[PDB]
């Protein structure tokens, strides 16, 4: 998704002996178009489905040898997903001032706020980007290259949660949805333990400052255990890249404290992990 006749028939200030009442116009005023995107709701997600199916047919290496016994699932080629992530980064934010894979500290996010805000605006104007991330999160080593988008989105979400006065998260639906989607994408891309998978699940009824602190712990964990092309050794069984975590002590402690401070509403979510 996304001249003078009329001015003469009502002139002379209705007096024919004095000047006009006003003193001129500034610009034009009363913008004619004022159009809003209301094309359709249905039959729009199916175009995205067809595009994702085409992309899957393109990246999946051949393919068609009846792997396994009866549930052969073709893996995604790392080169194709890497190229997709590269062109996505080039289309979203062509900047390269902070395109390093090493995650900078938290205070460093206070200088590139404009880039993070423009990335958030690009993500909110076109949701297909998120779907594209779902294609990059399939291959393990592919999401390690599309780190600038994740960093910018996380910084924008942190800046939004820092300036949120509503005591409930449901007041900002798109921001909560984007937070959960981003955490799920960066967790299923072999980068975060399932504790983060439970964190983006419990995000549904958490306080704004609690969500901000949890995302800050996510930033700290990604700064410590940075997504890098190494530590993704190949396996002799299949083409999947398995990441062996050599996890976060203080991060799990912060998560446990956040869960314990809201036992009156997140009691059933504790037994899951």
């Amino acid at each position: 998704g996304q001249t003078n006749r009329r001015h003469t028939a009502a002139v002379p200030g209705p007096g024919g002996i004095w000047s006009v009442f006003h003193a001129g116009v500034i610009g034009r005023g009363l913008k004619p178009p004022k159009f809003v995107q209301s094309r359709n709701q249905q039959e729009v997600i199916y175009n995205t489905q067809s595009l994702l199916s085409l992309l899957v047919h393109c990246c999946s290496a051949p393919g068609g040898t009846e792997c396994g016994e009866c549930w052969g699932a073709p893996i995604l080629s790392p080169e194709a997903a890497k190229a997709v992530a590269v062109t996505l980064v080039e289309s979203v934010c062509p900047d390269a001032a902070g395109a390093e894979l090493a995650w900078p500290p938290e205070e460093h996010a206070r200088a590139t706020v404009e880039r993070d805000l423009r990335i958030g605006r690009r993500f909110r104007e076109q949701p297909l980007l998120f779907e594209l991330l779902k294609l990059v999160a399939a291959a393990p080593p592919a999401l390690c290259y599309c780190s600038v988008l994740l960093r910018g989105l996380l910084a924008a979400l942190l800046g939004h949660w820092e300036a949120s006065r509503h005591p409930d998260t449901t007041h900002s639906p798109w921001h909560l949805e984007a937070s959960c989607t981003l955490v799920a994408v960066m967790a299923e891309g072999s980068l975060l333990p399932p504790a983060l998978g439970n964190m983006h699940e419990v995000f549904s009824q958490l306080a704004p400052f609690e969500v901000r602190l949890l995302l800050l712990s996510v930033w700290g964990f990604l700064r410590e255990h940075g997504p890098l092309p190494q530590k993704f050794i190949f396996q002799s069984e299949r083409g999947r890249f398995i990441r062996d975590f050599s996890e976060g002590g203080p991060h799990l402690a912060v998560l446990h404290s956040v869960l314990h401070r809201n036992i009156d509403r997140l009691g059933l979510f504790s037994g899951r992990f």
Partner: protein, 293 residues
Amino acid sequence: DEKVFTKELDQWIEQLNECKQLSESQVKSLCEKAKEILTKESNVQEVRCPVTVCGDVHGQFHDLMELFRIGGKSPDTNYLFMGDYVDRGYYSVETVTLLVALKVRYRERITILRGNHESRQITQVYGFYDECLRKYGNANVWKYFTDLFDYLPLTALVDGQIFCLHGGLSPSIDTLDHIRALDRLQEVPHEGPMCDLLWSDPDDRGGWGISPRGAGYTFGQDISETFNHANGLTLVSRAHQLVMEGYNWCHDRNVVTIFSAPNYCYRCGNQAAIMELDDTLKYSFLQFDPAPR
């Protein structure tokens, strides 16, 4: 519940319109209601034409009543104040009290922004804290007013083209999306985007430069043109400098300084002006002089 509170608000407004301040509990309740009301407003308040934008009042209740007599009554026509109505004035608490009462009573008929004097370190060195200590005896009304000033919006967007704000442009800000993503619930610092948004000044410099005030930068014509072209704007309204005619155009009719405080500090003896914008975005500069007391 609502009718009795509305009648109490009308009584408070009628009492304030006769040079009569309220009590401690009344001011406390008014500040609380203004806090719950202004919480829903964003940093860039989307104001719709027609309106009547004003400038600085600097705590001048008589000049405020003169402005109301000139530019129509408050409930009738819309108003857009751009800060500086709390310092450098004999009657400063009455002006801000009347403004906040009109805001909580006519939330959709009047908008007020935050200025450089709406803080905690400026009101203590310009007389507002002294006035609150002398009139109300204690120093609780001043605390309530300074706690409420943090909820005032920063800028305003009239008809999606006019950009009204107290200070002016910022070097760390390139679009309105950065202004909308700022935490205005914070004391005005000595450096940053909000400090520049509340302390900037226009000039023929070109680019940037340190301001002689001590905070904020000083932009030129090229910067104003770049800011107006990159945001779809056609004008930037401001009220931070002392003028004589009341309104001043700068940067090839791109910045409009509107000082609506006649006889500033009772020593200059200048005029004041407001800008009435009609439905078709036609501007009219209504000027006036300090009313005799």
